[PDB]
Amino acid sequence: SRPPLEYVKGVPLIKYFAEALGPLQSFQARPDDLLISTYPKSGTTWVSQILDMIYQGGDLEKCHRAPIFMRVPFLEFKAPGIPSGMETLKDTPAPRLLKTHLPLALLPQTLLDQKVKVVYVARNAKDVAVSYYHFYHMAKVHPEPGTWDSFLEKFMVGEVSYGSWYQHVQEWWELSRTHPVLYLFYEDMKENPKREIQKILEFVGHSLPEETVDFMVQHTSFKEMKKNPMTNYTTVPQEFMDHSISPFMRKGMAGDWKTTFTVAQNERFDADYAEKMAGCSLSFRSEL
Numbered sequence: 001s002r003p004p005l006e007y008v009k010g011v012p013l014i015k016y017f018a019e020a021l022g023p024l025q026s027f028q029a030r031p032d033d034l035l036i037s038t039y040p041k042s043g044t045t046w047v048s049q050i051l052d053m054i055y056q057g058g059d060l061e062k063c064h065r066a067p068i069f070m071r072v073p074f075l076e077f078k079a080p081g082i083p084s085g086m087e088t089l090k091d092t093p094a095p096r097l098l099k100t101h102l103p104l105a106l107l108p109q110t111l112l113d114q115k116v117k118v119v120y121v122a123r124n125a126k127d128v129a130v131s132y133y134h135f136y137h138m139a140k141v142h143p144e145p146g147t148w149d150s151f152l153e154k155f156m157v158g159e160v161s162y163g164s165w166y167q168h169v170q171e172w173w174e175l176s177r178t179h180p181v182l183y184l185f186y187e188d189m190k191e192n193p194k195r196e197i198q199k200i201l202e203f204v205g206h207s208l209p210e211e212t213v214d215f216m217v218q219h220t221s222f223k224e225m226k227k228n229p230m231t232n233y234t235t236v237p238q239e240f241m242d243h244s245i246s247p248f249m250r251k252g253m254a255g256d257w258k259t260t261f262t263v264a265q266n267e268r269f270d271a272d273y274a275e276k277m278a279g280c281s282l283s284f285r286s287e288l
């Protein structure tokens with residue numbers, strides 16, 4: 001319970017996830033796999049539901065066949081008493097949708113060699129930090145988060161599960177120049193979901209009638225996903241995730257960080273951010 005992070009090749013990982021890397025070395029990617037890649041709390045569950053819906057031709061019934069974590073295997077996942085992502089993967093039929101938060105230094109090479117299409121979702125760092133803080137509390141495999149004040153400090157130096165948010169969004173952005181990567185922003189999806197869903201459709205090469213897309217926009221909205229047991233993570237063991245501490249589907253808004261960050265924290269964070277993101281062409285929106 002609340003085991004400390006294990007550092008692997010410069011990356012701090014949840015203890016059990018680090019152990020999962022051994023068997024992951026046997027993983028073989030297929031040319032038709034699709035990898036959903038994100039830094040934690042950036043919209044992974046959201047885009048995963050959208051992608052599965054597209055794969056099921058928009059059939060909402062087919063999507064309820066099992067919870068999202070079973071439909072989209074989480075590659076490096078492992079926890080006591082729960083099957084590993086590698087185990088779930090064995091029973092997953094192609095074409096497969098795969099999930100990971102692994103930085104490139106740990107990503108299985110097979111995925112890059114097979115030229116697997118990647119859907120990457122990035123979210124502004126301030127909302128990510130607030131979302132991650134609460135997640136740390138409810139998802140018990142993480143170490144104690146401490147106070148918000150101390151967590152923010154750890155976040156800024158990358159001393160949190162999966163490491164630096166700054167390194168993560170930048171390296172995957174760079175990868176998009178030489179690998180098939182659709183780079184999305186959570187805020188864009190929030191602003192106009194239909195527009196982003198259309199971009200995903202064109203990327204994966206599928207075509208769906210407008211009526212079906214409108215239908216998808218409605219069923220992948222925050223309100224709908226928060227109530228759907230196949231996407232809100234409420235069916236997992238309480239010892240693993242305690243929704244009474246904080247729900248997985250917490251708020252689902254862009255700009256929520258403003259009610260948690262104090263002015264002093266905002267000034268310090270912005271000055272640090274300017275340095276770390278100096279030479280990057282990435283541009284994030286913190287509100288709207």
Ligand SMILES: Nc1ncnc2c1ncn2[C@@H]1O[C@H](COP(=O)(O)O)[C@@H](OP(=O)(O)O)[C@H]1O
Pocket residue numbers: 038039040041042043044045046127130131132220221222223225248249250251252253256
């Ligand atoms: N359909 C939806 N619309 C918007 N936000 C969504 C969403 N489904 C989940 N989210 C939000 O995405 C975050 C979790 O991302 P991930 O799946 O990568 O862990 C949470 O953010 P909040 O904690 O800010 O609410 C969650 O509420």
Ligand SMILES: O=[N+]([O-])c1ccc(O)cc1
Pocket residue numbers: 069070074077082083236
């Ligand atoms: O990622 N998760 O939280 C999971 C993944 C797989 C599982 O069987 C249960 C929970």
Ligand SMILES: O=[N+]([O-])c1ccc(O)cc1
Pocket residue numbers: 014040044101139141142
């Ligand atoms: O620690 N956990 O249980 C997690 C961590 C990341 C994630 O995307 C899902 C579940």
